[PDB]
Ligand binder design. Structure first.
Ligand SMILES: CC(=O)N[C@@H]1[C@@H](O)[C@H](O)[C@@H](CO)O[C@H]1O
Lengths: 402, 151
């Protein structure tokens, strides 16, 4: 029953962890029940990640669930490659094929490239943050030559917070040199709200400007401050609140007490936390399929010191990989299915534009069909005031007497 | 007075290791010396670098000369940054202020940003590989808007 797993959670991720415990209750059965070992660490420091991963490998876990930053992702991936320990995470996908990793986050690259091709953009800005890797940036730069775009790529990530008001105003005066009106905010939701706060201050949110929020959590941030500005805003949504399964989860989620489960009394859930809840369901059904297939997975003895030289890989970790990558269930992220590399496949991402009446589902793409949604004939406000420009020159346009 | 040192060298790098051996003989003095432990490894595997760093730390070296890739660099920086071990490298610099690291290679990007200015280039082609990295590519793109370049 007690199947041991390793848990690595950042120190600022409250809702992301509280989503893990709710998954532990919803998916626990009488056949068996997972026994997590949790340690809160600074995810950026890779030595602590190395120390914590070895702190789990010694205790004899069968799988590990955690996170990584740009600095620490290499530590996880290579340790899990030689030790055959399976790793499930909601953090960004690796920049290539890495085994013994189960990346719950879907590949956003195919969404953004297509979304730009829908709007027929041939010149746009792209403010990226290295915190989530430059895999998305390498794609737009690669596709810049095929479709003859002219990208204005600015590493907005490396900035300090005490000179933040001076440099952000200094940034848009550089974006003003080309008269740029098409920006892509490839940042995490926190930096987005920091950018959006400065966009209103200088006043670049009026009729004409068009932004893209290039992350899976469009509705997760605060969007009411540029909703009435007039500038069109796009984004991506993976946590579909239209579906019934989520509507059931939100009912139970909306009621819970916020003292025991921090960050849970709201009506929405972050795409990080939502994937955590679904990550439990993958680890559940994986060991469940290990029972039905009659496979022995318990450790023969002590795992030992992780720095084992020569390197010792336990053979029964392979079947845990093969069982994890055969899971095909339904959750908050639509269909959840994994390829031989652990990348999400068969998935569905919604495209949301911000209008006057709040968020609105307008499009969706798939790894086999792009930009399909036809059509959003329902809803619809039917309101528009066209802007006509002219010049005061007689007799075409003259001011009246009174 | 035999001082012990951690030596981290990749496999395909032979002349680099040659130069290290030459430097020791040229600078070794009569009253103290450098006693290196040389772990030849593949620099890309983060576990290997971790495994090799601890083999040097347990042997009790006083400083470590080595290299790093795009992947393994963060393994070195945090490991030395917490253990206070000194690391000396000719690999490309750290994108930031990481202590206990001695970067022998100087900052090339500032020079390239200036040379492009001298030739008065306004549109050009930039070729790069993701293996070495992209910090210079981040730099040319950082000043492509500021200086009106069509990269
Ligand atoms: C070919 C295939 O497997 N299609 C499935 C579809 O049947 C299912 O309704 C949906 C759930 O979101 O996920 C898709 O991947």
């Amino acid at each position: 029953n007690s199947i041991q797993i390793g848990g690595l959670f950042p120190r600022g991720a409250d809702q992301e962890y509280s989503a893990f415990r709710v998954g532990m209750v919803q998916f626990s059965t009488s056949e068996f029940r997972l026994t997590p070992h949790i340690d809160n660490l600074e995810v950026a420091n890779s030595f602590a990640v190395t120390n914590a991963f070895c702190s789990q490998f010694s205790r004899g876990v069968y799988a590990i669930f955690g996170f990584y930053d740009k600095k620490s992702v290499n530590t996880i991936t290579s340790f899990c490659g030689t030790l055959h320990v399976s790793f499930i995470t909601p953090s960004f996908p690796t920049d290539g094929t890495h085994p013994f990793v189960i990346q719950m986050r879907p590949d956003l690259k195919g969404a953004l490239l297509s979304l730009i091709e829908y709007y027929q953009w041939d010149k746009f800005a792209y403010l990226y943050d290295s915190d989530r890797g430059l895999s998305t940036l390498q794609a737009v730069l690669d596709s810049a030559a095929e479709k003859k775009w002219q990208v204005t790529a600015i590493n907005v990530g490396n900035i300090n917070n005490d000179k933040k008001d001076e440099t952000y105003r200094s940034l848009f005066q550089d974006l003003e040199l080309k008269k740029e009106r098409r920006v892509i905010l490839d940042c995490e939701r926190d930096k987005v709200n920091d950018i959006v706060d400065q966009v209103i201050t200088i006043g670049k949110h009026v009729k004409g400007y068009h932004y893209i929020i290039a992350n899976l959590g469009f509705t997760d941030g605060d969007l009411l401050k540029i909703q009435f500005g007039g500038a069109e805003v796009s984004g991506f949504q993976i946590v579909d609140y239209d579906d019934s399964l989520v509507s059931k989860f939100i009912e139970r989620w909306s009621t819970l007490e916020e003292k025991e489960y921090p960050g849970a009394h709201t009506a929405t859930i972050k795409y990080t936390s939502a994937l955590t809840y679904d990550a439990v369901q993958v680890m559940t059904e994986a060991f469940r399929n290990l029972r039905k297939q009659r496979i022995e997975i318990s450790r023969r003895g002590n795992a030992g010191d992780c720095l084992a030289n020569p390197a010792v890989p336990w053979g029964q970790g392979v079947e845990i990989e093969r069982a994890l990558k055969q899971v095909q269930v339904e959750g908050l992220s639509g269909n959840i299915k994994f390829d031989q590399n652990g990348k999400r496949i068969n998935y569905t991402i919604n495209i949301m534009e911000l209008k006057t009446n709040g968020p609105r589902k307008i499009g969706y793409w798939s790894e086999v069909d792009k930009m399909v949604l036809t059509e959003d004939d329902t809803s619809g406000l039917e309101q528009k005031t066209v802007v006509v420009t002219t010049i005061l020159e007689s007799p075409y346009v003259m001011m009246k007497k009174n």
